[PDB]
Design a binder for this molecule. Structure first.
Ligand SMILES: C#CCOc1cccc(C(=O)NS(=O)(=O)OC[C@H]2O[C@@H](n3cnc4c(N)ncnc43)[C@H](O)[C@@H]2O)c1
Ligand SMILES: C#CCOc1cccc(C(=O)NS(=O)(=O)OC[C@H]2O[C@@H](n3cnc4c(N)ncnc43)[C@H](O)[C@@H]2O)c1
Lengths: 521, 524
């Protein structure tokens, strides 16, 4: 499986300083293989580390019996369910490198993922609209001839994922990929018409998990509500579900981050940490004002907020109205994660997005041409480190643009740095809408909009929204009348995630040639 | 001299109803040839009709002696001076058809006029920057080889226009072009890169003058201040200087329409009518507020306003603050002139631009495709009538576009009509900036802007201005940032009128497309 390696001098330093431990990610679970403490709660169901490790082995063995081999890839689309974790560890024990699609994702995204990785395995859920029938599977498996095996959650036919998990492994021995080779693929937020995959080696991903666990002081006391899409890296590795497993804590799954669902779950399971995006924090605070009992969240000791900038106003209300510590998390799938520390001043937690998890995370701020700007100036985030990638999968064209001559990655983010060395997010250069923490590649939606017979020119831009931070607006130049329900119907046909449907559609007589900067004015 | 004739059924009707009298325009002056009453006041100088008609004959004879013949054309550039009228009548008595350039016009406009009409005669003013030396004349007369004779005002060399006017005609007899042939060329506001000339026959132009005199009730007691550029048709024919002459009144010339100049002239000469554009009306009302004596304007009985829409607010203040009747004049060089009547309700004079001077002026309002829109709806002005042309001079390309299949002319103006039959100007489709009543063909200035090494794309659009109604803004797509003083210096080099220099310059990375959306650019 090809990826961009670190230069040998960087790999040697990263090993010398103890970042790269040369252990597979499977070691996160197998260290607990003998333990009957609860690792995962999913409604009424409670899985021990012993059961979770046995399930992963069962499924690994079953897949090996069906002909899946090390160094092959897989497409996986499971939501906030126990089988997400079982599946991730099974494929890690086989040395199969998956993409974890979010439940929200549809035809266009699954097709794009399958086209780039040529998966030998597809794992999905009959609860997903695409997979309750066999029609789309038939098309999908024809168009993506790499796929040899289909396992399906909530199926009772020949393809039941449960029969695989419940079938006891006779004599199963793990073959994880080498620790310096690809373990799995993370999804980028997206800056382009086609999705870019991020190869993560075991050395690089395990370090990001292990160090996030040190900073967040996770232990076997950690009862972590995983309520955002579990397959995103913020929910998975910062420190996320893997960080909980590492520490021998308990992960409490929830279908979504609504107060209706999460308030009962926090009180019931005595949850002491969770991860939200700003609008969820807004909705929780409003729930408490609309009369929800504050005491339901008593056990809550740490609330992580990331994916988009938390307003100082909203930040300050967390300790007052909820009565736990805040942690700002400014991370990306490409690697770098900034954290506020548990012992930081109120000043730094409320007003900044913290600083890098690694001492050898390298972060400078660049002007338009590529020169370092002195501290306090606003510029482009340039980073590289021991858990930050060196290239997207099979993307020589884009990789040429995404990295400078020294292998520094440009996040497309505008930042400033304090005299104290803390990062504040000031703006964005990348053609990306951050809708409540969920990322929309504007070019992707524009290309779909131009496919409409009526649409001559399309621009997708953010507009300020109090709850969501940004909502999506399609500016369209059209041959004929075109109402917003027509654009949305059309985009659904093409098959994209709900969060990528324009919140607003405006037909306009003209657009400048599309120069987005001029359109904002 | 070739022009687009009216169809014979239209010409026969227009003669049958007395619109087309088949008399030359010279008849406007020659009817008064025996009169010693004052026709023109120009500073200290007062010309009788007797002297004016004798001057015109003198100059006509002198030009005939220098080899100018009937059916030839001429370029004339005189400002608000007596020699404008003398020259106009001389060329009419010879059957030479002129263009009357405005003083403000420069190289690019004169060149364009001379290129289209191939003039045998050039009459200009050594007071004009282009004519104080002999350099430009030498170039001009080389590039336009049709020119055989040059007469110059404020010259004391071989080409003195005064020696021609003062040289008494021994036995001179007039040879005006036929009344159904071209008498002269009017200038359009402009909708295109090169100027379009409007052929005016004697039948058609005389009617527009004669009928405007009936409506404005001009007589020998008409003392008319001509303070706007005298060679424009509003100042010349609606009813203007010719309508004053027709009626045997007096024309008082003024270099410009400033209160400083015109207040003294109105009191001194007991002026009872004048013509302004809205911003001049603004500046006059403000002059009175800044302490000018209202009594200076007592003699003023009618103030005409047109060229651009007068706001109801501004209109209402004229009777109150100045104490004369208002007349809204919505006209064009291509023919049609709408007037409020002297006996109209205050409601119609304040809020509307009146209705057509001719009963047989035909006016309907068209949608985007060309269908009639019902009574109070907003659309394109479509007109034809006995003083409205059927084509621009030597412009087959443009004439194909400017007229529908039935010979209706589109003014490029958006209008509505009252239930009472009165026109209100609502907007504009033609690519034209109306800067205080002065007209800028946007494409003309865009073509000059693209000539600049830095300029890739140019869009010229109007922006609202309180005084002027509209100012000009150039939107430019540039190889590097370019200051406004640089565009203006560059456009002056090319040689255009001051009023055509962009009031504002904006450098942008891109321009909006639908085809450049000028409507979007007005909204910034
Ligand atoms: C995946 C992964 C690893 O860990 C995390 C942890 C928390 C957030 C993310 C994340 O948002 N990843 S992303 O791939 O979906 O997007 C990266 C982008 O989100 C933006 N972002 C993330 N956090 C913040 C923040 N705290 N304030 C303003 N913007 C922000 C920023 O544009 C960054 O480039 C990723
Ligand atoms: C030449 C001639 C004979 O008579 C006149 C009398 C008054 C004005 C004109 C004139 O402005 N002629 S023009 O060729 O310079 O421009 C024509 C355009 O000016 C505009 N215009 C003229 N008067 C008005 C008006 N009163 N209200 C809103 N717009 C207006 C309109 O766009 C019209 O098509 C011409």
């Amino acid at each position: 499986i090809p990826f961009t390696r670190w230069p040998e001098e960087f790999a040697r330093r990263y090993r010398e300083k103890g970042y790269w431990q040369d252990l597979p990610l499977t070691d996160i679970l197998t260290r607990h293989a003998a333990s009957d403490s609860i690792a995962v709660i999913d409604g009424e169901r409670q899985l021990s580390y012993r059961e979770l490790n046995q399930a992963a082995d069962n499924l690994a063995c079953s897949l090996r019996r069906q002909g899946i081999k090390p160094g092959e890839t897989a497409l996986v689309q499971l939501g906030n369910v126990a089988e997400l974790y079982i599946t991730f560890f099974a494929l890690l024990k086989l040395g199969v490198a998956p993409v974890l699609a979010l439940f929200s994702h549809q035809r266009s995204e699954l097709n794009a993922y399958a086209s780039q990785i040529e998966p030998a395995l597809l794992i999905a859920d009959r609860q997903h609209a695409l997979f309750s029938g066999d029609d789309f599977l038939n098309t999908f498996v024809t168009e993506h001839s790499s796929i040899r095996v289909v396992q399906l959650l909530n199926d009772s036919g020949e393809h039941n994922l449960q029969d695989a998990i419940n079938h006891p492994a006779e004599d199963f021995t793990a073959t994880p990929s080498p620790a310096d080779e690809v373990a799995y693929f993370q999804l980028s937020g997206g800056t382009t018409g086609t999705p870019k995959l991020i190869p993560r080696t075991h050395n690089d991903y395990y370090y990001s998990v292990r160090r996030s666990v040190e900073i967040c002081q996770f232990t076997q006391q950690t009862r972590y509500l995983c309520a955002i899409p579990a397959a995103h890296g913020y929910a998975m590795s910062s420190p996320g579900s893997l960080g909980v497993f590492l520490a021998g804590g308990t992960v409490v799954l929830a279908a979504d981050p609504s107060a209706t669902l999460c308030f009962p779950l926090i009180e019931k399971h005595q949850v002491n940490v969770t991860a939200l995006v700003p609008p969820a924090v807004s909705l929780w605070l409003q729930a408490l004002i609309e009369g929800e009992s504050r005491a339901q969240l008593a056990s809550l000791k740490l609330l992580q907020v990331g994916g988009a900038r938390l307003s100082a106003t909203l930040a300050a209300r967390i300790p007052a109205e909820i009565g736990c510590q805040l942690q700002q998390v400014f991370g990306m799938a490409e690697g770098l994660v900034n954290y506020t520390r548990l012992d930081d001043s109120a000043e730094k937690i409320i007003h900044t997005q913290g600083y890098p998890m690694c001492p050898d995370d390298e972060v400078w701020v660049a002007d338009a041409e590529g020169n370092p700007l002195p501290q306090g100036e606003v510029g482009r985030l340039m980073t590289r480190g021991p858990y930050t990638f060196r290239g997207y999968y099979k993307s020589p064209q884009h990789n040429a643009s995404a990295f400078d001559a020294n292998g520094f990655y440009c996040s497309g983010d505008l930042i400033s740095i304090d005299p104290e060395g803390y990062i504040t997010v000031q703006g964005r250069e990348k053609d990306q809408i951050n809708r409540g923490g969920e990322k929309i590649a504007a070019e992707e939606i524009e290309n779909l909009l131009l496919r409409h017979p009526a649409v001559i020119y399309a621009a997708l831009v953010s507009m300020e929204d109090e709850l969501m931070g940004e909502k999506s607006c399609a500016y369209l130049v059209v041959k004929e009348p075109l109402r917003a329900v027509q654009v949305r119907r059309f985009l659904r046909e093409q098959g994209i995630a709900e969060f990528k449907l324009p919140d607003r559609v405006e037909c306009v007589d003209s657009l400048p040639l599309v120069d987005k900067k001029q359109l904002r004015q």
